[PDB]
From Swiss-Prot, chain A:
Residues with N6-acetyllysine modification: 216
Biological source species: Homo sapiens
Chief location bin: cytoplasm
Organismal lineage: Eukaryota, Metazoa, Chordata, Craniata, Vertebrata
Protein name stated in the entry: 26S proteasome regulatory subunit 4
Gene Ontology terms: cellular component: cytosol; membrane; nucleoplasm; nucleus; proteasome accessory complex; proteasome complex; proteasome regulatory particle, base subcomplex
Gene3D superfamilies tied to this protein: 1.10.8.60, Nucleic acid-binding proteins, P-loop containing nucleotide triphosphate hydrolases
Transmembrane segments: none
Modified residues (Phosphothreonine): 14, 392
Biased composition (Basic and acidic residues): 47-61
Listed GO MF terms: ATP binding; ATP hydrolysis activity; proteasome-activating activity; RNA binding
Swiss-Prot record, chain B:
Organism: Homo sapiens
Region (Required for interaction with UBLCP1): 642-837
Lineage: Eukaryota, Metazoa, Chordata, Craniata, Vertebrata
Subunit structure: Component of the 19S proteasome regulatory particle complex. The 26S proteasome consists of a 20S core particle (CP) and two 19S regulatory subunits (RP). The regulatory particle is made of a lid composed of 9 subunits, a base containing 6 ATPases and few additional components including PSMD2. Interacts with RPGRIP1L. Interacts with CRY1 in a KDM8-dependent manner.
UniProt modified residues of type Phosphoserine: 104, 318, 320
Keyword Zinc-finger attributed: no
Sequence positions bearing N6-acetyllysine: 508
The protein's name in its UniProt record: 26S proteasome non-ATPase regulatory subunit 2
In-chain residues carrying the UniProt-annotated modification Phosphotyrosine: 151
GO biological process, one term: proteasome-mediated ubiquitin-dependent protein catabolic process
Any Gene Ontology CC annotation: secretory granule lumen
Swiss-Prot record, chain C:
Function: Component of the 26S proteasome, a multiprotein complex involved in the ATP-dependent degradation of ubiquitinated proteins. This complex plays a key role in the maintenance of protein homeostasis by removing misfolded or damaged proteins, which could impair cellular functions, and by removing proteins whose functions are no longer required. Therefore, the proteasome participates in numerous cellular processes, including cell cycle progression, apoptosis, or DNA damage repair.
Phosphoserine found at: 8
Assembly description: Component of the 19S proteasome regulatory particle complex. The 26S proteasome consists of a 20S core particle (CP) and two 19S regulatory subunits (RP). The regulatory particle is made of a lid composed of 9 subunits, a base containing 6 ATPases and few additional components including PSMD1. Interacts with ADRM1. Interacts with ZFAND1.
Family statement: Belongs to the proteasome subunit S1 family.
Name by which UniProt lists this protein: 26S proteasome non-ATPase regulatory subunit 1
Residue(s) carrying Phosphothreonine: 4
Domain of life: Eukaryota
Compositional bias annotation for Basic and acidic residues: 16-25
Amino acid sequence: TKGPDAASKLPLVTPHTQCRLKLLKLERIKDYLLMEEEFIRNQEQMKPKQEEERSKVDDLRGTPMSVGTLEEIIDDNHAIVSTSVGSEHYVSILSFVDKDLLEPGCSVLLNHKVHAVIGVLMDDTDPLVTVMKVEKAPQETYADIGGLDNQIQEIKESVELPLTHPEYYEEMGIKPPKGVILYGPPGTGKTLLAKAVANQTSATFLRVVGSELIQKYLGDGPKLVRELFRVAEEHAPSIVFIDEIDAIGTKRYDSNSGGEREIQRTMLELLNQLDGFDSRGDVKVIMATNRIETLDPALIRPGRIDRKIEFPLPDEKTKKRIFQIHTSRMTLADDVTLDDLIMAKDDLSGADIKAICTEAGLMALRERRMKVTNEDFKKSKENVLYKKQEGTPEGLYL
Amino acid sequence: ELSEEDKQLQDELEMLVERLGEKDTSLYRPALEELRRQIRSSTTSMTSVPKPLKFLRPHYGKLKEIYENMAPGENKRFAADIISVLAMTMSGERECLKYRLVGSQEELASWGHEYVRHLAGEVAKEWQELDDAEKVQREPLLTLVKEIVPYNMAHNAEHEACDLLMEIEQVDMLEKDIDENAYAKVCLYLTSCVNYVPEPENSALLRCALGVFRKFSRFPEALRLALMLNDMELVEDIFTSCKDVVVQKQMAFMLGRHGVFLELSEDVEEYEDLTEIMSNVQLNSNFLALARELDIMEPKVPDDIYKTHLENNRFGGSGSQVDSARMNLASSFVNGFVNAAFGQDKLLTDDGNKWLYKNKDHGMLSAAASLGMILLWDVDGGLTQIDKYLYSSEDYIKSGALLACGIVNSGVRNECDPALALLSDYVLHNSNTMRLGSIFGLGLAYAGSNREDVLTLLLPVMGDSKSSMEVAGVTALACGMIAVGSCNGDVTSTILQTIMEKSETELKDTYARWLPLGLGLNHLGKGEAIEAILAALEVVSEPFRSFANTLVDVCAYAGSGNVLKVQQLLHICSEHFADMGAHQGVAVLGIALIAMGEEIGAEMALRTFGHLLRYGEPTLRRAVPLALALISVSNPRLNILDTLSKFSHDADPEVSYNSIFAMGMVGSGTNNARLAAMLRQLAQYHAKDPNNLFMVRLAQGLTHLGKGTLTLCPYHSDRQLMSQVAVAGLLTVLVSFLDVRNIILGKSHYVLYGLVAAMQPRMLVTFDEELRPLPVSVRVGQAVDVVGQAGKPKTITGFQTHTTPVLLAHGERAELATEEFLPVTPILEGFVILRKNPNYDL
Amino acid sequence: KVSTAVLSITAKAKKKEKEKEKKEEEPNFQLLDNPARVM
Ligand SMILES: Nc1ncnc2c1ncn2[C@@H]1O[C@H](COP(=O)(O)OP(=O)(O)OP(=O)(O)O)[C@@H](O)[C@H]1O
Ligand SMILES: [Mg+2]
């Protein structure tokens, strides 16, 4: 089974104000951590059997242990095993090995001298895949996202609600959506939403770049994708986030480009994993891309990617929410009227609002002030907002 | 480096500070006047760097000695002001404090907000540094606070004001200083800080907030804090002070929800309506409406709940034609719990005797109790069916019928008191089963009553040498759970005498664990009076001395969050030395029950329990799943369920049993399809062992409780309001489950029905001022505070639109999306009354 | 074993426990015989 390896996270300490309540909650966290440290330190200290078992098994197998590939199972205790050098050896299977675990192609621990099967290596996970697993959940939560109520609701119905409440889906008869593509202009909150869902989820989370799943050697790309998805299968409730799928999701086309055909083969293996022969199981996929129109139709089609969540440039209410969230830790003055920044049509995104807040803080620091003002925000708006050149036509239209 | 203005200001400051070398008359007034002017101008501005303070880096030693010798009048006071402002930036804590202490008073407001905050911090430091050896220094610090607090109140700095007032251990001034627009902020601050502050400051803070809420006439909140304090006199005071009959009805609803039944004098108008609401007679009816809103009138059958059509029938038509007793008991618990409180069942109502006749002894009691537990909160309706089975041929099952009565009267009260009348002539019954059933029914019917007549009637059972050990244990638990959280001296003395007269050989049994139980059940949430309790229990010899001490330590600090008690309990657990591991198990349950008071403490108790599981000895491994069940009752957190699923396949039968019960308790009433599938898989895997199958079917019944409309949470009012009756019920069930084979799998299945004492429903039925149901659009979502200490009601997000009545899962709250109505209680839980808005205009 | 700090309230608890406790209250030679061993 090998249930999910959910990322560990400390409880959120709120209020975020530098008050005594935050001190008390943080000191409660420190208290419990010290309790855990004391118990885990005095556990092995007071430890006075299985040592005979270890002294027999380890002595019999000996060190070092070679790692080979099982090729054939001839007898109940004899196997043809190929070493990493590609040389096959007819070796013996020692008694202290589960015969049901031995399968062709499995990674098998052999003795160094006689290469006899001393055990089976379970994980044998590519290091480029085990690094995709998330161990420390990101600090961003659903409370750090301003607006985006529809997008958050869709992503929760897709990858969150089925885990907590599969009762609705089972009762009505729907198979819950198992693929979501977060597409929109950059800086709108796609990666932020991925961070938030990773923080909230109780299922294992795999983060991919859409470009680290691509390897030098000819066949290692699709093989790496298959390994990643198999690992996702192992920890049954899983979420596989592939940021910037544009890297491999680009539309298929015919050209010589010996590397591009491997690119397309890798993406073909990806879409086979998403929806092909054999079921995919209880593993959700979240994909993010700035440009969706350049993606291959067979990748973003329903059944492979069930939902296409659009992240538009924030509107007035959403922008006001972003400003309220990102100046929450600030010390605003009384003359500040955030509205003037929220209005007008600068086409500023959530990342733009974050930079506006940061630059207003820097402007206040320039005047040796730890509290921001309206003038600082106004200066920061023009200082940071200068991104696009023209983006507009002339006075043709009345 | 500096600038032209900066250089000129630095030169001026250096000239002004250097002119103080000699004793010329036109020096001290001019120089100190100029320094005061510049410092006041810079400090009484925005948070810009205090340029005079940056320029000023001199030594005050000459300034301090001249302070000592020159001008005993106001000039030394000016010098004190200047050096205090200078040392606020530096580290001159004691000196910087005493400069404002003895120098020019003037006012702290004249300096600045940052100066006030720094002085507040230094005052707190000094007060913590000052013991009761002298009160001379305390008074001027109090005078400083007299002006510091209003500054914070008027400048929205209630944080620093509250913190300072907690450091000085004096909180009376909040009564006379809190404004209308700021009472909510400070009240929420206190109601959040009470959980983490240790004894005895938490109680003082709670009564301070109680006084504030009484002053501002927020009566429902006053009731909430009164039940937090767990003292009846202030509850009566609030009841008398409630002049609004709608608020009276609301507080009656909350009192019925908490199960607090206080006698009401006839001097209060509408006494009958308040009494009948507090007896909670209406609830079942509303529940019925609830069910007929969800079209879940039709009760279920264990065959469909187990989904036998999906299980791989490896043996078909040859291995399922034999009906063992234990699986029949499990099916009884299922076709009970699942269909409970819906007023109808398709197998126990039309085919009662035929069903019961295939049960033996214990099965008779279990099925008779489940017959009453299939219809909740209908005293007359329940007893109309229970009487015939009370008239049964096998009079031994008569006791079971009493359980039915005790399980039907649970959560309700009648003026004629059918339970007391029915069990008054049966408590003194000589038969062990008869007396057991009588006392259990009386306890379940009268949970939290604390009525003196029933306690006195239960007293002679303890002194009865004839009464068996299990009769004594059930009597002790019933006495404790009738007197939950009261520290009743009568019950305490009776149980102490009973345990003192008990012999070691008779104490060695498992049922003796229930003797401290009631004693502990008398002292829930009151750790102050347990020094005498532990002193009295120290007379008995070990190991049971340590066992009883640990159990009463759990019961005293139920939800207290006292990390020192948890440290003692963890030290007990970590000591690697059968009955010796009982102390470690009780201590593990103690960590659970202490940590469940706070969400942060509970979530760290999760990590501690994981470490205990992966690095503990067998007894700890058995004990932990009960603790995990206690931590997250009716809260199907997926990590907890995953750990329990991992350990349900353990080679230790006790560990697997405890893990299965933890599945049942944590996912109780959530109707989690994932949990249902995992339980079905566990039933398929464990199809051979009768005990594993029995407990997995019990877990399925618990998770399908009320078709997903029932919860066993001992917490209310945004999980802030504890429930003594529910905590008692889970405590009894868990400590009995510390020995699954002898108690749960032995002769004491009826103990499971104690969970029905904790059986509390979830709805959103909305009533008008006349108590008719009123459909109101409600915005329901997670209560994730997107702010800090802004006083917001957690700013409910994840919105969904519903029409009342609504079902709210654990951890998800509700709010009124319509301004047309105003709820008397801002906490939309259970039954509420909405007053029509007078401000709204059509 | 070892005792952890838990400095959150352990100092206050220990000082209040201290208040509660306050409320509660050569030769220089050897005689030798014939077979005497001497360094
Ligand atoms: N709706 C929002 N609410 C709050 N913060 C936001 C929002 N949108 C963006 N931000 C802020 O912008 C930062 C950067 O945005 P993010 O990482 O989500 O980019 P993106 O939409 O994934 O863009 P790209 O196309 O580059 O991948 C986030 O860390 C967050 O602080
Ligand atoms: Mg991004």
